[PDB]
From a paper:
Evolutionarily conserved in multicellular organisms, spectraplakin proteins such as ACF7 (Actin-Crosslinking Factor 7) can crosslink microtubules and F-actin56. ACF7 harbours an actin-binding domain (ABD) at its N terminus and a microtubule-binding domain at its C terminus. The ABD of ACF7 contains two consecutive CH (calponin homology) domains. ACF7 is a microtubule and F-actin crosslinker that is critically involved in regulation of cell/ECM adhesion dynamics.
To illuminate the potential mechanisms of how F-actin binding of ACF7-CH domains is regulated, we resolved crystal structure of ACF7-NT (containing the CH domains and a part of the plakin domain) at 2.6 Å resolution. ACF7-NT is folded into an elongated polypeptide that is ∼92.4-Å long and ∼58/14.3-Å wide with two tandem CH domains following the spectrin repeat 1 (SR1) of the plakin domain. The SR1 of ACF7’s plakin domain consists of three α-helices connected by short loops that pack in a left-handed helical bundle with a typical up–down–up topology, which is highly conserved among plakin family protein. ACF7’s ABD consists of only α-helices connected by short-loop sequences, and adopts a closed conformation with extensive intramolecular contacts between the two tandem CH domains. Previous biochemical and mutagenesis studies have revealed three major F-ABSs (ABS1–3) in the tandem CH domains, which are conserved in ACF7. However, in closed conformation of ACF7’s ABD, a number of key residues in the ABSs were buried within the protein and were unlikely to be involved in association with F-actin. Interestingly, tyrosine 259 is outside of the conserved ABSs and located at the C-terminal end of the last α-helix in the second CH2 domain. This residue is in close proximity with the hinge region of ABD in the closed conformation. Structural analysis demonstrated that tyrosine 259 forms hydrogen bonds with isoleucine 150 and tyrosine 151 in the hinge region of CH domains. In addition, the hinge region between CH1 and CH2 domain is stabilized by the hydrophobic interactions between isoleucine 150, isoleucine 152 and leucine 165, leucine 167 and tryptophan 168.
Residue numbers in the entry: 41 to 306, 321 to 388
Write the structure that this text describes.
Amino acid sequence: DERDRVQKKTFTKWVNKHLMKVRKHINDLYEDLRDGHNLISLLEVLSGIKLPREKGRMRFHRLQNVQIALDFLKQRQVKLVNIRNDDITDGNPKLTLGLIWTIILHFQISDIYISGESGDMSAKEKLLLWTQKVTAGYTGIKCTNFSSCWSDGKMFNALIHRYRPDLVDMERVQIQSNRENLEQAFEVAERLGVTRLLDAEDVDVPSPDEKSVITYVSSIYDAFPKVPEGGEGISATEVDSRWQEYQSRVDSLIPWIKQHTILMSDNQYIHFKETEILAKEREKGRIEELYKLLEVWIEFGRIKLPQGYHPNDVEEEWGKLIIEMLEREKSLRP
């Protein structure tokens, strides 16, 4: 009933987050969903599809608008146990929360991939596994739930540090109080685009509300750069290493294009071209292609791209090498 206080607070904040996009809003979850209009709007926002509506302001209009939402969920094979339209239109607290949870679970939490997963892991289990992989390497017991494991605030800070090590000091997190750790995690996460669904004072308890924590943790996962399934991309564990690869690659090619462009200003001129140039060109290609995978991390703020490291800055010296290549081309041409 205190987790209900908190779950309601979280689910309200979560709902308002999405209604914001269409200029809708709720104050009391147990009242402002009863006519079916905001439930529908929420589903339209979340799903990207347009739903029908019953105009009218009798109770059966209310019941039908709720039913339109329930059917839409049932049709997408969502399981609605015990929830019926009159439960919603009449304000049933426990079933209103269950319905929001069902929506959250289906639209936000369920769309997660984790290399290391099975086909038969729940979303909850997959998300748990992500947190374990991300925070592997920080001091702490293993995370096996979405309640007590999160109450001291250290997990939150580790999640963030993995993605933005410059924004968190994990040493200090070891000896700060739970409240300080929680407060500063929510704060920083906000800067990185994570809406504050939780209040530090509600999580600093022995058993924080699981559905609230999952919703927030899942939301952090949404905000962070991700590698799509099987696709090409860079995880938070590979970034430092790829970023160094990249810079080193440039620090190798650029000055070869510069020291091998001066030779062109002053019969083997066919080997200095169908051999090396086809290789050095390929470097330029390997480079510009790697930069593409890095863009995400540059936009995310993890990498500050120093000047003279864009794939362009390479093309502008490769162009210069193409010119002086053409000068001494028409000359060794008789």
